[PDB]
Amino acid sequence: KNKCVNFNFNGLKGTGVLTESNKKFLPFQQFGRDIADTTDAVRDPQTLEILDITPCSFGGVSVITPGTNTSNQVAVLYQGVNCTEVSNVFQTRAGCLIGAEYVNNSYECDIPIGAGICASYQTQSIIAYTMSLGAENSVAYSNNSIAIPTNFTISVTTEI
Amino acid sequence: LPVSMTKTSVDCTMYICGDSTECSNLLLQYGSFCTQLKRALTGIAVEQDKNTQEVFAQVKQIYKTPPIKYFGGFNFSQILPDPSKPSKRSFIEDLLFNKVTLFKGLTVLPPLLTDEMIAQYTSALLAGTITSGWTFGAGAALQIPFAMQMAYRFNGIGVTQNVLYENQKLIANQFNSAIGKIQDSLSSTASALGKLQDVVNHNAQALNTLVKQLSSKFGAISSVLNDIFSRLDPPEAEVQIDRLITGRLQSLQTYVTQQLIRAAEIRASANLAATKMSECVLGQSKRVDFCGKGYHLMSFPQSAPHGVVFLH
Amino acid sequence: QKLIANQFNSAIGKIQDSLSSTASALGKLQDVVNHNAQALNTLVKQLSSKFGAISSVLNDIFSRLDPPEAEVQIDRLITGRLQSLQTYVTQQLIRAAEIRASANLAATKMSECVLGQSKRVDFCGKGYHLMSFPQSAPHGVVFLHVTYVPAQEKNFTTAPAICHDGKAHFPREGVFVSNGTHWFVTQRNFYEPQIITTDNTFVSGNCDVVIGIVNNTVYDPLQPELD
Ligand SMILES: *[C@@H]1O[C@H](CO)[C@@H](O)[C@H](O)[C@H]1NC(C)=O
Ligand SMILES: *[C@@H]1O[C@H](CO)[C@@H](O)[C@H](O)[C@H]1NC(C)=O
Ligand SMILES: *[C@@H]1O[C@H](CO)[C@@H](O)[C@H](O)[C@H]1NC(C)=O
Ligand SMILES: *[C@@H]1O[C@H](CO)[C@@H](O)[C@H](O)[C@H]1NC(C)=O
Ligand SMILES: *[C@@H]1O[C@H](CO)[C@@H](O)[C@H](O)[C@H]1NC(C)=O
Ligand SMILES: *[C@@H]1O[C@H](CO)[C@@H](O)[C@H](O)[C@H]1NC(C)=O
Ligand SMILES: *[C@@H]1O[C@H](CO)[C@@H](O)[C@H](O)[C@H]1NC(C)=O
Ligand SMILES: *[C@@H]1O[C@H](CO)[C@@H](O)[C@H](O)[C@H]1NC(C)=O
């Protein structure tokens, strides 16, 4: 139990872990099926208690690189995988990133990782940071004051 | 108006046969379909995240609200964010977020800009449309009182400014009674936010049809491949596995193609939402029945999980 | 006019300095070419797949297998290639609808920003729009949206109205600003202080209705010349 092993209980061969359950099954049931035709729980044919079958840890591997022209250091991100199970470790909401330091200095988003956290080049090592939305500017509001400009600049903005 | 969707990413090996050793040696002769499908889904994922930044991150500087929240009789406590609750959203957006709510190789990717940062973009735009009027959308923020700001809203729609300065306490009482009845009519209605829900329910209906589609036998003996390899010879059952593999790959690409149309639908709605954020909130629009029914005066945007709500 | 003209030529002269330094500034039209060039090479390299048949080349299976068996693998390769060609145009039809929707956005922009003046705030560039200048492109269009941005701001004491002779006074164009111990009128987007007269103000009712009204004199321009 509690290991990724091949299960075969009167057929139904596959790969998955075995954990103790909590529901009260009916005695005529042999193997339980979850939604959309996936086997959730098969009871032991010998000792007659019930156990859930959870699939193995899987997910996408995202490699965050800054470009070969700058450096060769990378950072691997396992999407939706808690890396308590399989050099700095940072866990985000999308997954836990391996190979990047987390700083408190919030800057502009260069490489979109997810969940409000982006990565960029320090310049030496790959950093991880919360995205800086912008500088705070509390306007001094007053019911007896107005701001009117004295000069002006003409700007020409391009578009593609 | 809907802005973004659920960014989905599909795996190849677990969807077709679900952790089998036969698929890793047999799917490589099919070409590079697994490269092509993930280019389309990640092509959606950077696209839909671009649309929410094109709508909510239109401002560059984060404007903060003054502590003296008196604007000449007007009341904006229901649209400015609450400092007491830790989510920093208003009363309407807490009603907006609680009204609408929401493996086999199918994973869900969360968006980059989280909901508190969309609410912080909503709080910055609400502080800009109150303290400055049109100046924060066209350049630097100029401080202006709200009673004289509404005189700029009134002079643009053709009425001269003496009407507001004689009836300011009636206009301030009429707007506060109207904005108090907005959340009363929004919660009492059952299908007021049905547009954001059908976006969620259609994407929910697409993936559950996709995982039910593997349960079909595809004209073969069974839908599970462990029974096919055990009952027949591997040259005899190779025509049965290729019957299933092209059936499931067509099932996945049909899911990709209709998602590309729906992503092109909502991105076209998000560019429609991007101008309706710009002309109604960041400026004033002289159109007819664009920023609400009637002569446009002002607008107030509110946050949403997968959309945007304008109080025109 | 000497200040506006040199601000305009310095703004249009730094565009070639900005676009040559930022090589990824013109990335948006090149992904249109790069997505089509990657799609045709995907369509070309898909012929190397066997599609579950004996071989990827079709001439040898006509030469090796007998026609009672060879058309079975040919029909596998034909339905694999016809599905490859049908999906390629279908991904092209979604992409052509995106470019056509971008083309009508480009068509309405030159109709509104080049041929005339649009008063929308972030349609023809960021800021107060004055005019624009389109430029040619191999597969798109490049607009040079000339805008108007204010600068060198200054705070002033304001008032909604002015009571004089038992009567209120409301300005026609602009608002009332002040230094302190004086009051003048100016427009909104520029600072131009003028002496308050009856030429730019109008009287409507008494002055004790307006909240926060200040008391000051209004110089009638026909009064000192007649006396
Ligand atoms: C099988 O034998 C074991 C040991 O004698 C016993 O604990 C278990 O209950 C038996 N199971 C059944 C179904 O008889
Ligand atoms: C690396 O950068 C240099 C300097 O910009 C450039 O000349 C060179 O072509 C680049 N190489 C690659 C592979 O991008
Ligand atoms: C992830 O692993 C850590 C370390 O064991 C644990 O504390 C945490 O609760 C785990 N999170 C989830 C969601 O299982
Ligand atoms: C960020 O702040 C926390 C709390 O003070 C501190 O423990 C941590 O070391 C800081 N990290 C960096 C990179 O400064
Ligand atoms: C202006 O605002 C201050 C602070 O909010 C308040 O004390 C004062 O009464 C207001 N004056 C008017 C005329 O509204
Ligand atoms: C705004 O509404 C709240 C809630 O009823 C009330 O407590 C507050 O006094 C109101 N403020 C004004 C200025 O009317
Ligand atoms: C006006 O601006 C000056 C310069 O920034 C500042 O010192 C002063 O406090 C401001 N006055 C008001 C009333 O905002
Ligand atoms: C405002 O400041 C002083 C106040 O005595 C006055 O002399 C000055 O002329 C006024 N400014 C303008 C632009 O008129």
Numbering used by the authors:
A (entry chain A): 535 to 620, 640 to 676, 690 to 726
B (entry chain B): 727 to 828, 855 to 1064
C (entry chain A): 920 to 1146
Article sentences:
The trimeric spike protein is a major membrane surface glycoprotein of SARS-CoV-2 that mediates the binding to the host receptor ACE2 and subsequent viral entry into cells. The matured spike protein contains two subunits: an ACE2-binding S1 subunit and a membrane-fusion S2 subunit. Extensive structures of the spike trimer reveal the open and closed conformations for the three RBDs within the spike trimer, where the open “up” RBD conformation is prerequisite for ACE2 binding. Upon ACE2 binding, the spike trimer undergoes conformational changes to expose the FP motif of the S2 subunit to initiate membrane fusion that allows the release of the viral genome into host cells.
To our surprise, we found that mouse ACE2 bound to both Omicron BA.1 and BA.2 spike trimer with high affinity, but no binding to WT spike trimer. To reveal the molecular basis for the high affinity binding of the Omicron BA.2 and BA.1 spike trimer to mouse ACE2, we determined their complex structures. Two major states were observed for both BA.2-mACE2 and BA.1-mACE2 complexes, in which the spike trimer binds to one or two mACE2. In the first state, one RBD is in the open up position with mACE2 binding, and the other two RBDs are in the close down conformation without mACE2 binding. We observed similar RBD-RBD interactions in all mACE2 complexes with the spike trimer of BA.1 and BA.2, which is consistent with the similar interaction in Omicron spike trimer-hACE2 complexes.
